[PDB]
Design a protein around this ligand. Structure first.
Ligand SMILES: COc1ccccc1-c1cc(Cl)nc(N)n1
Length: 213
């Protein structure tokens, strides 16, 4: 029996689209900072959870462990960033991922033309898009205590899809699945991943675990 699934196909806000192009169709060294940004988001997601969790310890029913996991798959050619953070509700997701303007967008783009490093990205509050320095496509699976599991995805081109995730359940948190461009497979090597965590992500306040096949 054929399953059926709803997808909503959104246009990224004009400037988030401009930024995504700029990221994709421009060469930047120091791409590795994409992980730093992704670990940061999770860190922030783990704080929101832990904080709220002292008001409602029942927000931990969905998983008490507060950590980050990195899964590089040499077969899929995916680098998966998993956290047991707070997750996003649909609206958090759509505000976080594309629809709503970001007060740092224009400024960051202006900055990049002036030759700023892609590393500056986080300060402009549009850090997640660095994901696209290395991935052709990016899949975010996410789960918020209040809501259901969502699967967001974009290969860029100006649009993203959001669909309720019928798929591996997570309980709580966000999973960023990076479908690495052909030439960015270095980010599936244990050594490289360990390198960029020690380098840019040392003071994260949660255990981070690297799983290697
Ligand atoms: C796609 O992830 C994000 C993008 C922008 C801002 C925040 C996030 C985010 C939110 C949560 Cl709850 N977890 C994670 N890992 N990222």
């Amino acid at each position: 029996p054929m399953e059926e699934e709803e997808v909503e196909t959104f246009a990224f806000q004009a400037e988030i689209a401009q930024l995504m192009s700029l990221i994709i169709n421009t060469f930047y060294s120091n791409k590795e900072i994409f992980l730093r940004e992704l670990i940061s988001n999770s860190s922030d997601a783990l704080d929101k959870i832990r904080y709220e969790s002292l008001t409602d310890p029942s927000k931990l029913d969905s998983g008490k462990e507060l950590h980050i996991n990195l899964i590089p798959n040499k077969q899929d050619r995916t680098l998966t960033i998993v956290d047991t953070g707070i997750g996003m509700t649909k609206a958090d997701l759509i505000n976080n991922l594309g629809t709503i303007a970001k007060s740092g967008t224009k400024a960051f783009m202006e900055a990049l033309q002036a030759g700023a490093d892609i590393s500056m990205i986080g300060q402009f509050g549009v850090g997640f898009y660095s994901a696209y320095l290395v991935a052709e496509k990016v899949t975010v699976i996410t789960k918020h205590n209040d809501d259901e599991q969502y699967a967001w995805e974009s290969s860029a081109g100006g649009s993203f899809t959001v669909r309720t995730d019928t798929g591996e359940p997570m309980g709580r948190g966000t999973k960023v699945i990076l479908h690495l461009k052909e030439d960015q497979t270095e980010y599936l090597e244990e050594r490289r991943i360990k390198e960029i965590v020690k380098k840019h992500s040392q003071f994260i306040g949660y255990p981070i675990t690297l799983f290697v096949e």
